[PDB]
Amino acid sequence: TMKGISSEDVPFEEDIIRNPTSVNCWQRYIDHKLQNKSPAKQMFLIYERALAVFERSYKLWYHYLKYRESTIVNKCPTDNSWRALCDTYERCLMRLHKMPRIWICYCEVMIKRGLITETRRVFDRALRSLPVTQHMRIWTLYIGFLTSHDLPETTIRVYRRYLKMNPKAREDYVEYLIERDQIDEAAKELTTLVNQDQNVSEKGRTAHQLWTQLCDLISKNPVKIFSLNVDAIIRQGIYRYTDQVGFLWCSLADYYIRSAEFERARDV
Amino acid sequence: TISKNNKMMAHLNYRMKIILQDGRTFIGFFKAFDKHMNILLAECEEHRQIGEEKRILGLVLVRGEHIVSMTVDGPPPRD
Amino acid sequence: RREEIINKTEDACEAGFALMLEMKRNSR
Amino acid sequence: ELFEKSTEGEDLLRNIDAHYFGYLDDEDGRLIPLEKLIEEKNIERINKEFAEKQESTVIGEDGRPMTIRHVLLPTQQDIEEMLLEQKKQELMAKYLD
Amino acid sequence: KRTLYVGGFTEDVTEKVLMAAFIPFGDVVAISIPMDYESGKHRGFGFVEFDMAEDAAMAIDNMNESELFGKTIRVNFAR
Amino acid sequence: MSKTHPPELKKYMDKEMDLKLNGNRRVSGILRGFDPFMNMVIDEAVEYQKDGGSVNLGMTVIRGNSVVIMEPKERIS
Amino acid sequence: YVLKERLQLLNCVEKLAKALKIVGDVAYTCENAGYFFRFSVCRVWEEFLAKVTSKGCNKLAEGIISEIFPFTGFFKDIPDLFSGNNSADLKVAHSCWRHIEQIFEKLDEFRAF
Amino acid sequence: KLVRFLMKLSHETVNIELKNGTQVSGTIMGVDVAMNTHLRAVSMTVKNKEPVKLDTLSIRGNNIRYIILPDPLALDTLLI
Amino acid sequence: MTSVGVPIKILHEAEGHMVTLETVTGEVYRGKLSEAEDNMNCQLAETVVTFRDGRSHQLDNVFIRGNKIRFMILPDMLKNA
Numbered sequence: 001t002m003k004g005i006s007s008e009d010v011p012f013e014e015d016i017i018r019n020p021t022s023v024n025c026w027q028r029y030i031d032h033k034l035q036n037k038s039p040a041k042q043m044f045l046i047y048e049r050a051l052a053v054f055e056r057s058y059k060l061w062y063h064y065l066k067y068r069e070s071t072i073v074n075k076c077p078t079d080n081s082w083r084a085l086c087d088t089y090e091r092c093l094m095r096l097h098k099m100p101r102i103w104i105c106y107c108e109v110m111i112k113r114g115l116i117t118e119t120r121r122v123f124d125r126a127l128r129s130l131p132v133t134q135h136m137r138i139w140t141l142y143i144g145f146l147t148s149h150d151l152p153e154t155t156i157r158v159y160r161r162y163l164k165m166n167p168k169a170r171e172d173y174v175e176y177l178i179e180r181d182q183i184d185e186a187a188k189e190l191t192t193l194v195n196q197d198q199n200v201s202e203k204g205r206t207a208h209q210l211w212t213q214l215c216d217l218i219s220k221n222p223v224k225i226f227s228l229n230v231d232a233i234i235r236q237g238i239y240r241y242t243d244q245v246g247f248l249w250c251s252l253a254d255y256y257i258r259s260a261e262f263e264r265a266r267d268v
Numbered sequence: 269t270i271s272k273n274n275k276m277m278a279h280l281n282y283r284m285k286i287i288l289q290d291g292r293t294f295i296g297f298f299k300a301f302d303k304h305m306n307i308l309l310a311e312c313e314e315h316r317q318i319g320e321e322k323r324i325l326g327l328v329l330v331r332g333e334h335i336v337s338m339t340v341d342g343p344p345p346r347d
Numbered sequence: 348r349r350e351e352i353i354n355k356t357e358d359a360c361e362a363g364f365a366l367m368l369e370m371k372r373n374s375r
Numbered sequence: 376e377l378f379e380k381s382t383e384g385e386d387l388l389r390n391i392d393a394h395y396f397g398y399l400d401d402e403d404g405r406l407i408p409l410e411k412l413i414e415e416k417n418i419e420r421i422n423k424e425f426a427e428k429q430e431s432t433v434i435g436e437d438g439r440p441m442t443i444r445h446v447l448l449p450t451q452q453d454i455e456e457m458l459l460e461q462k463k464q465e466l467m468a469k470y471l472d
Numbered sequence: 473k474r475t476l477y478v479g480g481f482t483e484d485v486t487e488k489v490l491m492a493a494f495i496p497f498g499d500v501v502a503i504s505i506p507m508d509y510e511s512g513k514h515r516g517f518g519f520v521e522f523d524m525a526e527d528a529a530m531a532i533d534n535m536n537e538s539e540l541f542g543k544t545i546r547v548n549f550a551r
Numbered sequence: 552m553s554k555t556h557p558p559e560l561k562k563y564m565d566k567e568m569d570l571k572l573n574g575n576r577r578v579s580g581i582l583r584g585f586d587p588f589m590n591m592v593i594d595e596a597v598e599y600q601k602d603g604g605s606v607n608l609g610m611t612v613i614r615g616n617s618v619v620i621m622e623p624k625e626r627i628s
Numbered sequence: 629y630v631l632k633e634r635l636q637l638l639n640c641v642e643k644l645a646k647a648l649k650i651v652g653d654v655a656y657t658c659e660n661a662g663y664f665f666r667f668s669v670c671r672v673w674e675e676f677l678a679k680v681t682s683k684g685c686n687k688l689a690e691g692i693i694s695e696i697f698p699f700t701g702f703f704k705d706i707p708d709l710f711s712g713n714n715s716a717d718l719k720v721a722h723s724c725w726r727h728i729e730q731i732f733e734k735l736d737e738f739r740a741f
Numbered sequence: 742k743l744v745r746f747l748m749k750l751s752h753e754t755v756n757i758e759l760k761n762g763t764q765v766s767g768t769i770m771g772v773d774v775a776m777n778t779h780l781r782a783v784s785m786t787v788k789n790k791e792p793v794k795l796d797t798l799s800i801r802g803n804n805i806r807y808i809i810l811p812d813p814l815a816l817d818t819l820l821i
Numbered sequence: 822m823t824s825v826g827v828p829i830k831i832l833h834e835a836e837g838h839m840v841t842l843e844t845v846t847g848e849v850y851r852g853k854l855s856e857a858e859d860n861m862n863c864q865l866a867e868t869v870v871t872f873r874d875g876r877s878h879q880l881d882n883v884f885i886r887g888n889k890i891r892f893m894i895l896p897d898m899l900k901n902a
Binding site: 020 | 458
Binding site: 393396398429431433434435436438443445 | 666674740
């Protein structure tokens, strides 16, 4: 049945009824109910009742949402109890949507559920909802989630959003794309790096070293690259780089030899 | 238990017994550790030898230098 | 670079001619 | 090499746009079937690792339909009278006995 | 560890607004906004004291670099 | 790191105080001494013995590590 | 125009919240108004349709829709909104809902601004 | 050096003497140089008290008066 | 940055309240505490001592040297930290 009162926590319940003025009257109740070592289903009720009065209190929400995650932790993440936790974060965010920790905890819970398709969507909401100055807390989770999985097409689109606010991460984007065999996209981003005239990147590479990594990448992968006139860029290195002309003529031939275009290899 | 930080954390949330230089034996909960072996003892009870006597005590901090013997044996605690 | 450029165009032949043989068979 | 040594001796807001907030990235929809395939292997992967161990439906924030599971609970008024009846029983029992 | 420094807010942020903002994190015991006597307005910073140190830590981890009335406020422990 | 300073001995120095010793002996003396070793200097002091009468102690030194028990007659303000 | 209309729509959200006796800064932003719509306006609306469908079809008084309809205070500038016929009043009630729902649809598009 | 013996010393059985004329026998399982002594499967014999058994005991090594060491412990390699 | 002195922070929190301590002579002292040092030296202002038979005396000041003493009992308020 839906009704039932103890003999032992009635003073805390009656105290709240006469003193509806502070969270402390509920905290004394909630703190008491835990010392009893009481059932989790009763704790959810007292928290949701307290959060009906004090719906903007971050403390009770953060404690309640973490208490749900605590007692459900022994259940498999496929279980519907983890789905019910996410629906509780939605109700929390309907007040505390400007608090980053709730968004971060919501996103971590979606990762623990292992779903992908709308975990990305929860992240997209967090970016729209939080101040831009808070977004670095989100992006390091958002990218970390995506780069933990074999999700090349999604991660590409999310990264070129991310690099509009943190362009210094483009070096790490290149390293991701190479590991995911996105060689043509990796070479596109390297050219974007080489088109920046800063003397060195945050990974300690100068423009000549970044351009050498492009010539490396572009000559040794003839079959995998399509957007770049590989011959044109390497001849743009025989131009200007007068101290390595003999190397770059062989590097251009090496590209054609790996393409098995031996006729044009002899032309070079 | 003694001094080592990682061992200190494992022994928390258990009932621990202390014996001192004057023959009294103490049993108390603890949740603190100083690497020079100073610990905070809570909900303690002491026994005295004259006959026998027991007293109810307030919360205590203990210095390891005085501790003669320490042992850990307890059920799930009270908060 | 004298040792770099020769030996790295030697494997380039190896990778290249291994692929050439695959192409010459698939044409059949 | 002196320029390589020059850093040793030694602005995002203007680029935030509609693309950053993800208004211009999701019309395609071919991402979901790839995500689905990884999503199910995750479910199997967690199962194997674990094996050894009211409602409202509304248009959500991102235009996609969600559901809210509003909690149904006795509010303070119903529990106020519930504890009232309980305490009267022990009081009258103590007064007679 | 219980007193926080809040800085960078707009002239529309009164003591009641800071009280309103920081109450979500815990019980606030006092707020002190040093006002500039020459202008009669605050210097764009004010202090908030919490009853519990854990509530102050939750305030930093959320309110730091938040927008309050369109300006990014900085929240840190008052040195 | 930083460590700490000696106590605010200035608030208690030059007052007249009684000192207690092991074996239930009593001493009454004026105190004026401080050092980084935290010793004590007592002057114009009188001893109350457990096995005799009383004698006056002329310019008395007490090693700081050994004994430190004080009872003062003037209330601190 | 978008900035001007957004402000006039949020005044309606304030007016709607006043009719619902909901206290809070729900008209401050489109984002606040969207959560207000989903959690509160939609809940009360679905709680109205439940009373009509589960009981009002055959075991409640005639014209009770004129009593249980929640947004009567929002359309206070329309006289004689409900005629007193449950089979008819449910249609204009749905027409009243589409007016409220259209306000928040416009806001959700204006959030980008 | 003596510091090598205390850190290496583990698993063997020893008898321990405490300042209050108390004797203890316990097996050691610990790895540190600071002489912190942790015992398991312990028997206790206090002066003017009956013997009692203890499942585990922990002792500040500096407080111990002297430790009695078992026969197969080749102390010579530990002392070097 | 600095991160050291964790017992010192606890010791500072114990200041201003009432402490209990016992001495090698066997009697128990009760006193209000407001002085602390890294070398564990401590001073109590206003103090009451009680002996193991029935005699008690009041003391206005007691100074404690941190290296030739038995340990002191700190107030309960520290548990909140």
